[PDB]
Amino acid sequence: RKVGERLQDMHGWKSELQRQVEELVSETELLLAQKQRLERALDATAGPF
Amino acid sequence: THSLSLPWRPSTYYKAASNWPTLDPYCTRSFTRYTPDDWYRSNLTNFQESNTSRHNSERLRVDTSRLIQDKYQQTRKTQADSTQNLG
Amino acid sequence: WYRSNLTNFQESNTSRHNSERLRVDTSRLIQDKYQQTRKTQADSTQNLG
Amino acid sequence: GAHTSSGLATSGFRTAK
Amino acid sequence: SASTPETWAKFTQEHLYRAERERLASVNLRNLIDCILQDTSEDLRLQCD
Amino acid sequence: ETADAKNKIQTHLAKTLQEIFQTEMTIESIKKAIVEKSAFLKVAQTRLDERTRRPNIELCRDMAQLRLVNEVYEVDDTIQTLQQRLRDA
Amino acid sequence: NLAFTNRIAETADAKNKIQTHLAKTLQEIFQTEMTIESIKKAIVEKSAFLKVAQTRLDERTRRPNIELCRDMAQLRLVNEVYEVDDTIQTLQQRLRDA
Amino acid sequence: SIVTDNLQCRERRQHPDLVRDCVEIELLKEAELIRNIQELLKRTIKQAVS
Amino acid sequence: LPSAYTQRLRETAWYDPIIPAQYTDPSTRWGSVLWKDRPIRGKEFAINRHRF
Amino acid sequence: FLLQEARQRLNSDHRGKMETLDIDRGCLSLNLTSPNISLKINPTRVPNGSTSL
Amino acid sequence: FLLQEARQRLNSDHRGKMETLDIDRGCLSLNLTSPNISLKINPTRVPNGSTSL
Amino acid sequence: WDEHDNRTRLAERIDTVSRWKEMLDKCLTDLDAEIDALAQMKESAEQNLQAKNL
Amino acid sequence: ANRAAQHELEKDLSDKQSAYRIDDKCHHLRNTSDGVSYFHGVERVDATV
Amino acid sequence: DKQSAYRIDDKCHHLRNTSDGVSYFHGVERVDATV
């Protein structure tokens, strides 16, 4: 019974670490898109000068 | 709720806490006989850690020598050519 | 032609009294830190003995 | 002068007797 | 052994907390990038007008 | 007014060269203070590392250890303040 | 007592090549100290070069209204400044790893 | 080299006469004195070329 | 001298706003990767993983 | 004007190729008993923007 | 002891080779344009150490 | 033209002195290896001497 | 029973002697002692009975 | 004009490492008013 309740307590920490990994990778995808937006804006700045 | 553990055995905690310093303290706030296989496993692990750390620092020495010679020559040539253009 | 001269002398003496205050406070802090740390080292030797 | 800045890590070792 | 249960929970909890701080920093940076890009585009177009 | 204006600028320049020499000496003194506090950290933390290899009941929560923690914290604040002084100079 | 003979030969061999490993570790610690000293000397020398180049450029840029000229040496000095910046940052990264 | 050879030499000594005698403390002082001497010679060598 | 500095010398702005050209630099511009390793005992410490 | 635009496009492509060389050389430099290796989370996974050969 | 002797002689000779390379490469990098170009006091001065090839 | 031919002579001397330095580097590294490989053999004689002590 | 209590005091004596050697070598450790080096996280790491 | 340019570039050229006139200047990169 006590080994089973140890498993029961540790499943929550495993799932929470999982969840934070997908949240950080989705946010990194959003920021990595906005970087390419910035670089294309820099090239379109390089024209009018 | 800690207990007796009348011989205190902190070696594994010292190894883990040296690998990661963010593990907070381990104190008694509010069996007992090793085996020959554990003897051999412990000192062979100590030998392997010594060899690994020695070879890491040796390879970093070998890289750092050529790195610093190359960067010294590169920066000296950059200075010399800049003085050439001003002249 | 006068208003350049007065501003030049103002920026000169401002930089000077800033640097003099800096140097005297620097020497004071060096002496303070030296004596404090030597004292607590002597305390360390005393408690180990 | 006095080597107050550099500390090497070793001595001529004998443990306990 | 190597961990009290409270020590182990603190280890995982501090890892999650620092990851969440970095996620909020990324969100703040994305909003700042939005503001900068829009303002620079509007100022350059008003000057060309 | 060219002559006495030029003499005023000359006096300002000569004393400015003097004051810059003193500020450079101040910079080198802060550097020497920094490296000696680094050696003091080295001594204190090597002592604290070697001390905790004791036998089982000899691991003791002594006033020596409850002082060595404040030793390492105080030398950390000292070296932080001296680094700040270096940036300001 | 033959069991004791076994155990003493076993522990004596453990002692002996523990001693060998200790000697090799101390010699490598010596050479690590000499390498980090070389890194620190290199960092202060590159700081001196940065001083020289940027002093030259700021002394040059006070020129009169007609002679504000974009010569090759100005572009060379700008490239030199960012090159020695990259050099300095690489040396601090190697210092931290050592 | 000769000091480290004598220090390692005195560990063959049989267990009654494996001693910390007058020789051991003086050999420890010899090792530290030799290392201090050659480190200080290295530092004055560094001063000379500057 | 090479070409990007020459087109900086000339009149119109047919040059890069970022001064070190990528065909001259050892490293990427705005490149986000290090291959940074960590100190764990017994497992090696490899410097310059990106130039293997 | 058109040549400047073509230079910017080729420059973006060159940035991409140096970054790919960086990440692939590091992934090759990994071997056994390395401090970074770990049982990762959901590999054998194809992301949103993945393109074909 | 003999191996230590030979090591010390070879180490001194290697250090001398590094020094003469380090000064002669700068002598090659000297140009018509360098600042420290000057009339020295006595050219064709054979020094006290005359060691031929 | 005399400037250029003396430049060639001096670059040749750079090449030869670099050759001699690179030729002594191997001897230095090999002497380090040889003193370590000889120092192990005395430690073999060490353990053999105690093994004949008993 | 007398043999038992005598052995208990002898093992405690061995513990005190080794701790005495440790604290002696810590006491004479000055600066310029040719035995010091950096240590990281030791300010937090402790086992304590 | 030209004497001023000659002397300012002469002293910039004759400046060297470990010379007296060196000093830590800042921000010379982002300023450029060249006509």
mmCIF file with all atom_site columns, N, CA and C in Angstrom, chain L residues 6 16 24:
data_model
loop_
_atom_site.group_PDB
_atom_site.id
_atom_site.type_symbol
_atom_site.label_atom_id
_atom_site.label_alt_id
_atom_site.label_comp_id
_atom_site.label_asym_id
_atom_site.label_entity_id
_atom_site.label_seq_id
_atom_site.pdbx_PDB_ins_code
_atom_site.Cartn_x
_atom_site.Cartn_y
_atom_site.Cartn_z
_atom_site.occupancy
_atom_site.B_iso_or_equiv
_atom_site.pdbx_formal_charge
_atom_site.auth_seq_id
_atom_site.auth_comp_id
_atom_site.auth_asym_id
_atom_site.auth_atom_id
_atom_site.pdbx_PDB_model_num
ATOM 1 N N  . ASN L 1 6  ? 65.451 40.753 -50.299 1.00 0.00 ? 6  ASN L N  1
ATOM 2 C CA . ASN L 1 6  ? 65.759 40.523 -48.890 1.00 0.00 ? 6  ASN L CA 1
ATOM 3 C C  . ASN L 1 6  ? 64.528 40.100 -48.098 1.00 0.00 ? 6  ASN L C  1
ATOM 4 N N  . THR L 1 16 ? 62.940 28.097 -42.019 1.00 0.00 ? 16 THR L N  1
ATOM 5 C CA . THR L 1 16 ? 63.923 27.161 -41.462 1.00 0.00 ? 16 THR L CA 1
ATOM 6 C C  . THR L 1 16 ? 63.881 27.122 -39.931 1.00 0.00 ? 16 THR L C  1
ATOM 7 N N  . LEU L 1 24 ? 62.028 20.028 -32.756 1.00 0.00 ? 24 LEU L N  1
ATOM 8 C CA . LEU L 1 24 ? 62.278 19.809 -31.326 1.00 0.00 ? 24 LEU L CA 1
ATOM 9 C C  . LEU L 1 24 ? 61.018 19.551 -30.503 1.00 0.00 ? 24 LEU L C  1
#
